[PDB]
Subunit: 68 residues, 4 copies
């Protein structure tokens, strides 16, 4: 009914990183081990941080991808 916690280190949001030289990002919804919305990303230096979906921060990312 209302699962909580399980296997998602991307809890809350890793917005500590800033959007700009991004390359690609994944977006998984709240699955089983992840009852919360989970979004991970990837930079130009093939590494992956993670952002949220209910914030204008990642909207600057997708918006930066629509620009082209």
């Amino acid at each position: 009914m209302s699962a909580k916690e399980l296997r998602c280190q991307c809890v809350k949001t890793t917005s500590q990183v800033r959007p700009r030289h991004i390359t690609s990002l994944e977006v998984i919804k709240a699955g089983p081990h992840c009852p919360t919305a989970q979004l991970i990303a990837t930079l130009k230096n093939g590494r992956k941080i993670c952002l949220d979906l209910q914030a204008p921060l990642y909207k600057k990312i997708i918006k930066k991808l629509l620009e082209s």
Copy 2:
């Protein structure tokens, strides 16, 4: 050829698939081998099709991920 046809496997858009029962999707911008905007996706049956970014089709996907 002035940014056109390089090594991208999903040209135009693979909208032949319908939204819902999805799991996660990739969002890559127009890189080098892919001068065009490229977006891939993933379904419940761990497979991957691909959609576009300038259309309301994938907007139904992200919107389906925000409703939660």
Copy 3:
């Protein structure tokens, strides 16, 4: 020695899952946030667990991918 617990959900090994109806699997080396060897995986039910690289468990996976 290099870094200590930064961004790795696959600590030790998630071998609780058994190999068989797999689809694809990732394998990242020990980066910065992940000084430990880290590899994730994907099943038929588009989900992702994670295994190790110094064990015969994932070798049954790659071996199952070579048989074809």
Copy 4:
């Protein structure tokens, strides 16, 4: 039991790239759209090429990931 016109993101093998400063690589078996073994990869410059599974080329990659 059916193999006709499908969509492999990488036919044959993109060995044109050399192994060395890699970051992570995908390993998907012969799915439906891809009845052939399909393996993709990722470099330090977050990009993705693709290699094979029945060759010692990618074995140098996994071997380089085990050395650690």
